[PDB]
């Protein structure tokens, strides 16, 4: 029983569905996430829809509100789970 | 006396009612929470309405804005209190 | 001179007025706060309008967006200041 | 070139203009800030428009979304920069 | 496949496009970012559209929701990536 059903889920709203991401490095994500809950610390790389892709020196419990198209595997040492 | 009565409580709004969650592992939560205030550190598992359920390596004071249907007890080592 | 006067103060908006809370344990708060800026670390207890009251193992600089009716004094070892 | 021009700057929106605050003690702030980016750690005191003023045991990188009228200098050991 | 397409990207919304910033000192940023994901810790300087520019003693994983026009290179010891 959710009292917050019939509310529209916006981008600023909390995470409704989650899925662990694997760094495919050649295909895009199946769904692009609103945020990334990082599982373990490390460096991981993220790509926009514009190709600009950079490396993030992320921390373990860090949750970063970036919305990526593709997560590559070359510089990725940190596993994450995408929130949506 | 609340001056913010007559304001609608949205998903992005602060927590109005709280309840400690027990990892039933076979039944859903009585109310699904907007967020989880973690009581003690550990790993705990959370399920969507889509079944995707993953494990979160959460920290003690961490408050994670994920909205789960069921909190299982198999991998759960961290007690939490749900916010709503 | 505030340029953000004539803006409505919502629940998600920053804190306009603050007041230090004392754990009365027998009476409700004079105003229920939007959030609690914790002054010193410890455990403190908070009650909803539904009576559900739990204990929070809070940290020193932690600011927790829970909106309580009553702050009891039995398990309260942490002083806070309410934001509104 | 800002793509987010023509968007209205709300209270919940990111900081557009910043200014370092000096604890005058006797005069109000020239502009009251939406938040306070703390520069160095310490204790600093903040006053509402209601006079309630308390002391905050703030930390170094802490950013606290309180909107004060006057920042006094008696208990202030922490320098901040106001965001707006 | 994004389910949150057709949603308008506001200032409070998560980061859609990112780009690493170089402290030009003498020219403005190509796009002014909504926030700054800091790559490595240090001090870095940021300028408004009003010229007020101050120094921020930022930390490594810190993400600061300030919206600067120009990032100078004189006091900048911390590399960042702008979010937008």
């Amino acid at each position: 029983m959710d009292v917050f059903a019939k509310h529209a889920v916006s981008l600023e709203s909390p995470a409704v569905r989650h899925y662990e991401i694997t760094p495919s490095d050649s295909t895009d994500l199946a769904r692009r996430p609103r945020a990334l809950r990082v599982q373990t610390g490390g460096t991981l790389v993220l790509r926009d829809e514009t190709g600009i892709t950079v490396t993030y020196t992320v921390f373990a419990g860090e949750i970063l509100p970036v919305r990526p198209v593709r997560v590559l595997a070359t510089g990725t040492t940190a596993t994450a789970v995408g929130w949506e | 006396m609340d001056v913010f009565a007559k304001h609608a409580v949205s998903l992005e709004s602060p927590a109005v009612r709280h309840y400690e969650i027990t990892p039933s592992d076979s039944t859903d939560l009585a109310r699904r929470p907007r967020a989880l205030r973690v009581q003690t550190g550990g790993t705990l598992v959370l399920r969507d309405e889509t079944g995707i359920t993953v494990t979160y390596t959460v920290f003690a004071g961490e408050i994670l804005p994920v909205r789960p249907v069921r909190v299982l007890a198999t991998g759960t080592t961290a007690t939490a209190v749900g916010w709503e | 001179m505030d340029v953000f006067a004539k803006h409505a103060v919502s629940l998600e908006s920053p804190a306009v007025r603050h007041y230090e809370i004392t754990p009365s344990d027998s009476t409700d708060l004079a105003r229920r706060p939007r959030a609690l800026r914790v002054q010193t670390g410890g455990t403190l207890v908070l009650r909803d309008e539904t009576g559900i009251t739990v204990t929070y193992t809070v940290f020193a600089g932690e600011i927790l967006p829970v909106r309580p009716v009553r702050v009891l004094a039995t398990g309260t070892t942490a002083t806070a200041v309410g934001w509104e | 070139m800002d793509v987010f021009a023509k968007h209205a700057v709300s209270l919940e929106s990111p900081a557009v203009r910043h200014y370092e605050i000096t604890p005058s003690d006797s005069t109000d702030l020239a502009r009251r800030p939406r938040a306070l980016r703390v520069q160095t750690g310490g204790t600093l005191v903040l006053r509402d428009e209601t006079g309630i003023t308390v002391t905050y045991t703030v930390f170094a990188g802490e950013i606290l979304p309180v909107r004060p009228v006057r920042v006094l200098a008696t208990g202030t050991t922490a320098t901040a920069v106001g965001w707006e | 496949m994004d389910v949150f397409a057709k949603h308008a990207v506001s200032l409070e919304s998560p980061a859609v496009r990112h780009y690493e910033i170089t402290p030009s000192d003498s020219t403005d940023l190509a796009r002014r970012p909504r926030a700054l994901r800091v790559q490595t810790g240090g001090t870095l300087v940021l300028r408004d559209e009003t010229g007020i520019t101050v120094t921020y003693t930022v930390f490594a994983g810190e993400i600061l929701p300030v919206r600067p026009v120009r990032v100078l290179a004189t006091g900048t010891t911390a590399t960042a990536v702008g979010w937008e």
Binding site: - | - | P14, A35, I63 | E12, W83 | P14
Partner: peptide, 10 residues
């Protein structure tokens, strides 16, 4: 920035 719980930017 302010007192929401929303995984947002600010």
């Amino acid at each position: 920035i302010a007192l929401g719980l929303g995984l947002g930017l600010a």
